[PDB]
Scaffold this active site. Structure first.
Site, PDB file in Angstrom:
ATOM      1  CE1 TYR F  22      16.884  40.570-128.307  1.00 49.86           C
ATOM      2  CE2 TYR F  22      19.135  40.171-126.994  1.00 49.86           C
ATOM      3  CZ  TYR F  22      18.414  40.388-128.199  1.00 49.86           C
ATOM      4  OH  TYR F  22      19.143  40.782-129.320  1.00 49.86           O
ATOM      5  CG  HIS F  99      11.966  40.386-134.247  1.00 55.19           C
ATOM      6  ND1 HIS F  99      13.105  39.754-134.491  1.00 55.19           N
ATOM      7  CD2 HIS F  99      11.166  40.479-135.480  1.00 55.19           C
ATOM      8  CE1 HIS F  99      13.193  39.492-135.894  1.00 55.19           C
ATOM      9  NE2 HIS F  99      12.035  39.878-136.522  1.00 55.19           N
TER      10      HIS F  99
HETATM   11  O1  LIG Z   1      21.173  36.923-129.443  1.00 58.48           O
HETATM   12  C1  LIG Z   1      20.247  36.747-129.034  1.00 58.48           C
HETATM   13  C2  LIG Z   1      18.850  37.199-129.749  1.00 58.48           C
HETATM   14  C3  LIG Z   1      19.293  38.206-130.938  1.00 58.48           C
HETATM   15  C4  LIG Z   1      18.125  38.845-131.609  1.00 58.48           C
HETATM   16  C5  LIG Z   1      16.702  38.668-131.340  1.00 58.48           C
HETATM   17  C6  LIG Z   1      15.577  39.348-131.681  1.00 58.48           C
HETATM   18  O2  LIG Z   1      15.041  38.448-132.899  1.00 58.48           O
HETATM   19  C7  LIG Z   1      14.628  39.886-130.598  1.00 58.48           C
HETATM   20  O3  LIG Z   1      14.226  40.929-130.544  1.00 58.48           O
HETATM   21  O4  LIG Z   1      13.973  38.889-130.211  1.00 58.48           O
HETATM   22  C8  LIG Z   1      16.112  40.783-132.591  1.00 58.48           C
HETATM   23  C9  LIG Z   1      17.352  40.242-133.575  1.00 58.48           C
HETATM   24  O5  LIG Z   1      17.945  41.497-134.272  1.00 58.48           O
HETATM   25  C10 LIG Z   1      18.493  39.563-132.963  1.00 58.48           C
HETATM   26  O6  LIG Z   1      19.711  39.268-133.656  1.00 58.48           O
HETATM   27  N1  LIG Z   1      19.950  36.743-127.663  1.00 58.48           N
HETATM   28  C11 LIG Z   1      20.920  36.472-126.692  1.00 58.48           C
HETATM   29  C12 LIG Z   1      22.164  36.533-127.074  1.00 58.48           C
HETATM   30  C13 LIG Z   1      23.100  36.467-125.913  1.00 58.48           C
HETATM   31  C14 LIG Z   1      22.653  35.823-124.730  1.00 58.48           C
HETATM   32  C15 LIG Z   1      21.248  35.934-124.148  1.00 58.48           C
HETATM   33  C16 LIG Z   1      20.335  36.106-125.412  1.00 58.48           C
END
Ligand SMILES: O=C(CCC1=C[C@@](O)(C(=O)O)C[C@@H](O)C1=O)Nc1ccccc1
Ligand SMILES: O=C(CCC1=C[C@@](O)(C(=O)O)C[C@@H](O)C1=O)Nc1ccccc1
Ligand SMILES: O=C(CCC1=C[C@@](O)(C(=O)O)C[C@@H](O)C1=O)Nc1ccccc1
Ligand SMILES: O=C(CCC1=C[C@@](O)(C(=O)O)C[C@@H](O)C1=O)Nc1ccccc1
Ligand SMILES: O=C(CCC1=C[C@@](O)(C(=O)O)C[C@@H](O)C1=O)Nc1ccccc1
Ligand SMILES: O=C(CCC1=C[C@@](O)(C(=O)O)C[C@@H](O)C1=O)Nc1ccccc1
Ligand SMILES: O=C(CCC1=C[C@@](O)(C(=O)O)C[C@@H](O)C1=O)Nc1ccccc1
Ligand SMILES: O=C(CCC1=C[C@@](O)(C(=O)O)C[C@@H](O)C1=O)Nc1ccccc1
Ligand SMILES: O=C(CCC1=C[C@@](O)(C(=O)O)C[C@@H](O)C1=O)Nc1ccccc1
Ligand SMILES: O=C(CCC1=C[C@@](O)(C(=O)O)C[C@@H](O)C1=O)Nc1ccccc1
Ligand SMILES: O=C(CCC1=C[C@@](O)(C(=O)O)C[C@@H](O)C1=O)Nc1ccccc1
Ligand SMILES: O=C(CCC1=C[C@@](O)(C(=O)O)C[C@@H](O)C1=O)Nc1ccccc1
Lengths: 141, 141, 141, 141, 141, 141, 141, 141, 142, 141, 143, 141
Positions: F22, F99
């Protein structure tokens, strides 16, 4: 009073080739039967064939621009072309989808058409005569 | 030539009911349109309608015994009845499946027919004219 | 104001047969209960059962032609009959689909209904009380 | 003789919001209608709503411990929450699943409920009256 | 070594409720057994339970920051929560997924876990002993 | 014009955690970027993040009552939450689904969103710049 | 003592029609064969055939009332009729499903039977002889 | 207590081959680890391995006749063998299914097991320590 | 540098003047001008091309691959149907932004699968003609 | 005529084991029942059983070379073995597939057989008597 | 050094040519052995041709090829569509693995169109009859 | 004997591009290898490539008229074009489908080919040598 009859890929080889699947009537002979039928009905038919999707698209565009009816046998593109469906969905005048063979008596994948949902109607399995029946429907609006 | 036109369940209520879906022609007016076209074509047509699957099978069995062609709009039974498919599979003369509406432009379940694989061909979406085009095909044999 | 309560195949054997599945109330008892309930609500109930799809269709056409509401338990046809769905779809007055058993706690095939999408509403698993609750809904509209 | 009416997510916005889909009755008006009907039936109705799945689960646990009947409109969680299903499964008194809208005439995904298999019964599509009919069932059982 | 044992929705009611499904051991009893086993292995176990997905995620976020291992029984969320999977996928120390019941001997929908693909391992069907066996794995490395 | 930017579960941990998936921007840095870009565009952005679905629903209800646009990255809830789709479907101002990651280059399950059918549009895979692009779209209405 | 052999739709046309699929034995000849075989076994065979589902349901109701065994070739209804399955499920004495043809060597759709899971057993593809083997089973119980 | 640890096809080559998938511990080493663990627990473990399905069935038959518990790593047969499932279903003492690798983090086909539904429980992805955890479970029952 | 290729696939030459209820009222010519104006704001050059011919589209993609230039692609119906186009796009070393004018997820189910998305850098759907201008701004910054 | 009766894996344990599923007849007793019934019919039965697929294949090849019919209960291999199917397709004399249990009243996976489409016919659910009925079919060719 | 290649045929292939000669040819397994030995000699290879109806025997041959680091040409017959164990033994091979089917498995029943072996094989040759084995050998001789 | 070797879309870029996927040999170099090899075999090869489906169909129609065999690497059209399948199905001489990469070790969609069922055979994953091996087959028929 103009109707377009448009044939897609391979169909230039009708009659001469694959007679057990698509009949013995050649593409030239079909053009002559369509023109005879058209005359009896008081219509002008324009018969086109191409193996090029871009060409087929261009002819559909012309028919949407002229608001003329279309009888279409898209060949293999029936089951595969979203681009062809989207051009056809633009038509304001009726669109009749024709298949010479009974697509429901063949492979499963031939039982799905991209064109059928946006067509006025569909004639399948009645051979060459399908085109001629489609013409008569259009003569009745 | 004798041609049997057979309509399945609910179709006795044509025109008077559900005109937006199945047209404004009544069953009585259909019968007369069909007789008119049969005369023009030099055929005799016998049109029958029933809500009873057993009655439909009996008519199919009679067309089978006489080797007469069938034009069939089975209504809902198109999508459901293997018994009707199996009766129709015995026919030696042509069998033309007709749908007044475009079953490809409606619910997904209507896009599957048990009759199409065993029919000579199918006409869909062309309104009541479907039955007249089917007769015209049978006249050209 | 007349309400039609229609029961499909096998439901003549209620109470006496399959009590562990459809309850210990007989069809004669159910008619009397429904008539009782209808009296209190100031409605008239006509309750009819048949094993014949054609007869069930005829009763549906009568409610359609009368614009009277229908409480329908189609039994096995709920999951199989497009012909029945199509007749019910033409009803202009409310249609309430009723199942005595909880069709979601049984075989997965009982979890799909051809009727539900075209009904006003559905009541499942409340036993014979589902018909009485359906009446009271109709009484208020 | 105490019945819990539990509404899940977004349902506090009934009436004043999304009238074409879930009706013009607000959540306050619904609580008042429920309490009036409860009075008529000799029952006490406790009506709660929450957007929190944890809060809904606590209310279910409480009705399990109190052996009180539940009428549950779980909203979106109907189609998604195994946790809510597992909490409901331990209820000893009846569970009536209620949907205001006819979930079978909407997106295909609304036609599966994790709750229906473990419910005593299900009422769908009968609007707000579905809660009042669920109440009447519980009063007679 | 500090090991986090995290129990999801409804598991606060273990032993007292649904013992034919999840056993007769209560959540307070489970805490005790885990603490005792942790002392024997020379670890410290912290055991928590919540019906709130947001609360479970906060506990996972904390184990991620402390690089501490997790033994997780997510309950119904196992089959449903992508957000819980995404939080668990951040953990750098081992994650052991535990189900008290044998999820393969129940409804089909229980046979898919969003957590298993991102877990170090999974233990199913061994009752409360699954937790104790996971603890011993974590002591060994 | 006020615009609400709503981040769903786990996204409080942006940047200091999972940077390879991310990106390297922290949640605090994202708010600053968004506020500075909204300032250039002549908009006021209110950025909020929560791991609680109930809390997210509350903010969506608020935007519905205020008729304000929403840029929503629902995180895992995208693929699972019908309650979130139903709250979003009531927005009268535009809804843009964002996303950070390209959800089509990952597990098959991330390729379906309950939100996309009810959103004005969707931006996927453009990183944090996707929020800032969404803002520019809303600036042009 | 009494065994009920029941043949469903189109099977009155056995022998004289489709001999390649269902054999050269006519329905009259089949009746004779079954009756003679049954008598050699010390049984009395009553052999019925109808094209009407409702008549088939009526015969099964009577065999349920009389606690007599049934040998059933339902024809096309095997694959389609829940009403028939529901009537057959209440039979207390043995129910043997018979198909003359090997349904597993034909279209995929013939490989699913609504009857087989509620039948005692099923004989497929052994021709006319299947009904005689079923009788011999019943003679042993 | 006698416990049988049974390994299926190719697992004679553990440790020496495919060490990146199934670990570096050889089958000889695994036998000595299991024997040491079992001594500690006060059980006797008999460890066997075969590439021959017939031979694995014979060993399961012996554990069924002797009412001895089985720890089974069936390897590829886990996903394919109904005959092995049926032998295993006959066991009255516990059956613990073990996978060294995390089968949920590999190809989709490894996420279905024929054994898991008839097993006491399953342990997946904890490497060789899986067999030791399963032994310890059986020492407790 | 920062030369960016905007490629429109079949039927899209008829934008604006046809099907305005589904694809907007901006014509292909108007869209070319809007992108050029935006490109001048961003400090980059945009080349905008359109063809109903899959082979022509592939050729333009090859040329972008050979020149290591980014592409903004609205493949039209071929989005859902062409593996050949996906395979040509997968060779691109610079970014690929997939753009749909309409919201393909509010339409027929078959429009919710793209062969291009798994190999694109990202995707903008449903934001009308402004999707192309937003893709340009992404590219101006990465 | 020599008839070969071949039993697949675990069927050597008939009678003595899993009595409620496959009946109380032992394999020794089945062999004597078959030999006796064969005599009566003036046939010679050879009855064999193996847990080894390679052995069953060898027996099938031997019947193919001798042009002898086979009655086969393949046990679990029914649903899994394409090799067994292909060996059986070599048979010029009849092949009768037998299942003691009603495979259609059990797990969904047992409702599919690789053998049925290549067998002459199939007998399911009639217990041990199914072999005796197969033998009688073979006596009449 | 004369490169050894193992040709392994699975269940029922010892009966090649019994039926259906339009699907599998009329050449028998022993005639096939001779044709392969001859072609291998021409290419400067040594072909070891073995057939069994026993899955455990096929695994043991594959284990040997793994230990010997020898290429394998495999026609697994029905186990192609069913055996995960056979796939997992083949995954261990370090030298090339060429999957061969005599018939065109895409022109027959749908269940023949999925192979557990193709994803782990170097490559696959189908529908070219017995010549498929000889082509596999030539590929191995070049690379 | 003339043999046509036809390469579909993007294959003009072999070797110079995507070498880790389709090898280091350029299309010019491949034309070189093939012509030589064919000559060695006493054949003449005509090697053509195009990105245009209509051009590939024309080359197929020419081989069909000439009764000449075809070695076809259709590129992505392999998985999508029914029109190409239909043109190929008309060939009377052998058709060998070639894929340089092992399509079964890639995305799931590459594991389905519209060409394989109508081809004589298919060679996959053998790199550029698959073309030469196909020529050698054709030297022999
Ligand atoms: O858990 C998430 C986000 C998850 C997620 C985000 C998306 O919407 C995107 O691409 O932004 C795609 C979607 O499939 C998804 O589930 N982030 C995180 C988890 C742990 C530690 C740090 C950050
Ligand atoms: O390739 C085709 C037509 C293909 C075709 C036609 C149909 O629309 C139809 O029945 O008219 C059904 C449809 O499934 C299909 O693909 N014809 C051809 C090929 C080579 C030589 C001579 C003729
Ligand atoms: O019920 C029907 C016809 C049913 C029907 C007809 C079709 O075969 C067709 O298009 O001709 C499509 C097919 O899917 C279907 O089920 N008609 C009716 C019902 C109530 C009142 C008046 C008429
Ligand atoms: O056959 C039936 C009713 C069948 C039936 C009823 C349901 O609508 C319902 O729950 O009311 C569910 C639906 O799945 C179903 O098929 N009844 C019967 C049979 C034999 C003897 C006595 C009674
Ligand atoms: O979100 C909801 C209700 C959602 C909902 C309710 C149903 O159980 C039902 O028919 O009652 C069917 C189910 O499919 C579902 O998800 N309502 C709302 C949303 C915004 C504003 C005002 C009201
Ligand atoms: O709700 C639950 C547990 C839910 C649950 C547990 C599992 O993870 C497991 O087997 O541990 C399997 C999984 O499929 C599942 O959903 N328990 C509860 C409910 C009410 C009262 C007391 C206890
Ligand atoms: O229609 C039928 C019987 C149909 C039928 C029979 C089977 O139960 C069976 O094999 O006995 C298998 C099943 O799949 C099926 O549908 N026969 C017929 C039709 C027209 C003329 C003469 C005879
Ligand atoms: O073939 C196998 C093991 C097969 C196997 C094992 C599993 O049960 C497990 O994880 O233990 C997962 C399962 O899906 C699987 O098929 N091992 C091997 C092969 C060659 C050389 C050395 C070892
Ligand atoms: O045919 C098209 C575009 C088709 C098309 C475009 C999309 O990529 C998009 O939303 O941009 C969605 C996608 O599903 C799709 O197929 N346009 C047209 C047709 C006739 C007249 C005027 C314009
Ligand atoms: O394993 C088996 C037989 C298995 C079996 C038999 C069937 O062919 C049949 O009904 O005869 C149905 C088929 O689904 C199946 O797998 N028997 C056994 C196992 C342990 C102890 C004693 C007996
Ligand atoms: O059993 C077989 C061949 C099995 C078989 C062969 C294929 O691998 C291939 O095309 O080589 C395709 C694959 O689908 C398959 O199962 N032959 C046989 C059986 C009995 C008597 C005589 C010969
Ligand atoms: O696009 C392609 C070939 C595509 C292709 C080839 C295959 O038939 C094969 O393995 O030969 C497998 C098939 O799945 C596929 O689509 N090559 C390319 C693209 C850009 C630059 C350089 C080369």
């Amino acid at each position: 009073l103009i109707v377009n009859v448009i044939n897609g890929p391979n169909l230039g080889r009708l009659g001469r080739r694959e007679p057990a699947v698509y009949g013995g009537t050649t593409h030239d002979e079909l053009v002559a039967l369509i023109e005879r039928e058209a005359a009896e009905l008081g219509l002008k038919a324009v018969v086109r064939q191409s193996d090029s999707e871009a060409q087929l698209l261009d002819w559909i565009h012309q028919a949407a621009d002229a608001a003329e009816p279309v009888i279409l046998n898209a060949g293999g593109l029936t089951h595969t072309s979203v681009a062809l469906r989207d051009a056809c969905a633009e038509l304001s005048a009726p669109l009749i989808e024709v298949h010479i063979s009974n697509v429901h008596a063949r492979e499963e994948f031939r039982r799905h058409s991209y064109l059928s949902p946006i067509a006025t109607g569909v004639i399948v399995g009645l051979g060459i005569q399908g085109y001629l029946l489609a013409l008569r429907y259009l003569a009745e609006h």
